[PDB]
Design a protein around this nucleic acid. Sequence first.
DNA 1: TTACTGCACAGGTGACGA
Length: 769
Amino acid sequence: MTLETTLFPLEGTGACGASYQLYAVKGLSGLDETEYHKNVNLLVRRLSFSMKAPFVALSRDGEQFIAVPNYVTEFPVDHRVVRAMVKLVPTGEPLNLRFDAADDEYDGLRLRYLDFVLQQPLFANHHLWQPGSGQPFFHKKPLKRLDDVDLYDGVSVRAAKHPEGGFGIVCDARSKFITHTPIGARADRKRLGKLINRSCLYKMGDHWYQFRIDAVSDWKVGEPSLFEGNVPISLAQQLVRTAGNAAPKSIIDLDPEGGALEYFTSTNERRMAPAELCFLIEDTHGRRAAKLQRQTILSPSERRARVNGFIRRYLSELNIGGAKLSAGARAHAFFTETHMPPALSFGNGTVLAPDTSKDRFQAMQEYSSMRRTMMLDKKVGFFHQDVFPPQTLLLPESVKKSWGPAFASDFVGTVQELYPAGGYRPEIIEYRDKAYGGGVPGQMKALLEVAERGEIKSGDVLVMLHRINGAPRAQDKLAAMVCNEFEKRFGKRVQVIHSDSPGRGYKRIFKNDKPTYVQQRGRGVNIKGYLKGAALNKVCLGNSRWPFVLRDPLNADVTIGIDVKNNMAVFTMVAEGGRIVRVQRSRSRQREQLLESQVTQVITEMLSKELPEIKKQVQRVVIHRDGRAWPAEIAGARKTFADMAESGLIAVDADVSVFEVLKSSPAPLRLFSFEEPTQENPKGVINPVLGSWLKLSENDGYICTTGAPLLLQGTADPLHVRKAFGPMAIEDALKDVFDLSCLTWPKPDSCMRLPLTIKLCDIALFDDA
DNA sequence: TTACTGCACAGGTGACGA
């Protein structure tokens, strides 16, 4: 119940002045509403970088109004490029914003100013450095040396509203891996060329920052490559005359034969840096270094200690102009109620309820384990139990000729034990995986040829693919193409598994004077665990056999997720308790945004199909957007339900609310709870329990969809959800985000960070050609 | 096959810097 945040109060913010002059923009009156705001923030960005001041957008009614810090003297007022030229006309009457007010619509302006100015004292601190604007502040001294690489520890700092009045800071600890020795003056042109698109740390004397390698310079560090006025000058000479005071040796004594890297400014200009002073950023996710990556996962005690250390060390005096500022010693804390997980419905009339006579941790551990054990028990089992329609299992020819048959026997038996009512009995087909080439073309050619001959009877196909890209941070192009083509050209619905994972589960054995494949249980995969998980996710869930659903209504009757990435929009709908659930794809104009018409079409048709199955009059609707929400999207959403309320398909006074689910949060906040201090945990800091939550304002809140009993390591990352429109209170939306995240269908005995709504999108999220 | 913890890559309402 006792919970603490990483929100620190701000002190001395009396006598703080945020002077803006509003302007407004003509441009062309073609408010494309999808091209309009694009250009709005393109110009805001351009001005913020060129003039280096905190330009903001405040969008009232017309949604124009760039806000210009009044302390810039010469202002272009007219701005070129950006399609038709834009004229900036002031709305007179300068603003002088203060931090002791009630809730205004100028709060975005204050937060922008506060963010901008809080990072001058840290930018000036000799012992800190920042990769780039907005990013966290890391110590120059590494936290640790791991062999060839250094582990740097930093803290991110964002301004925010304080729920007990005023403004504060939300911070989080952060990590970065950088190779210890530099690229070096002795590295030749071929080596540097092989580094294009890596990022590196540049120790330009006392000023450290990070940039993306874009090309290799033709001129060496000592050869003339610049102009000082009209005299051609070397990079060495330029770095010398921009050093000051007692400049370090490294910047004034470069090897003249060393090479230089090239990069782009934020304002899009060309610059050089000597390789002698650049240290490659290391990717611990790619080139999968488990031992290194584990160093970045912090216990709650480690996290709290590092965050508070940074606060007390660098945020106790903070001078900005005549301004004296401080960060409170101790973070905001509260007593809160924690949400209980919802009662769930399983097969045969059985309900699972959290037990309230146990302490919250034990009760949550029992409930989570029970989700799996009730799914498996043939006396209770899946909430939705029916026979499957015909099924196909489509295997590569090379697999069918070796270990395919043994895998299929085991998989079929595993499905029948997990879901005894389906009578799973797939027809096994092969495709010629070696006949054409084994890139994405050629695999696709063999899959399509098998589909053309009519060999895939039935509409459900489970297809085993080869893994073309084994590197992480890689989308499965082949799987996306297979789903898209089998849906578009045939009626097929396709789930995917790969060949590497199960193949590691089987070894060839001599039995009865015959070669046979049998299970091997050493290492590389846990084959039983694989068979069970793939049976659940690819066959049961893939045929929409939900193992359990909510017993009680959410605050929302219907709730709809949206994600647009790769010109591939995904709409999702959960209704009743998760008894309805649908998922549609759509080809969007842009890669990551939606036209208002497309929204108001897909949603209307999708919901009209299901409305006769929704046996309660519908009156509250919620949309969960995965990421930023655009107002063309909001307009379409409001229009859909105003129309359906007029018609009578819905309650005449039904309402809509829209919420962005920010999984990477721009203001990352953490929650801690406390136990009795043990010898290992001298302060007794621990994770918050699963249902914990907090709202900072009417528009910003946090739920722990992950938390204490079910996390094995690290500290929980609370989920940030922010309202964008509508009458639903933020607390109610937090509660049923949490209830929707207890529908842990992919892995019943575990916690799950995203609510089921957006969980559907980010797995069905695919590619377009 | 799947769950979280993590960084980064891009990819961003974003100030620096040869």
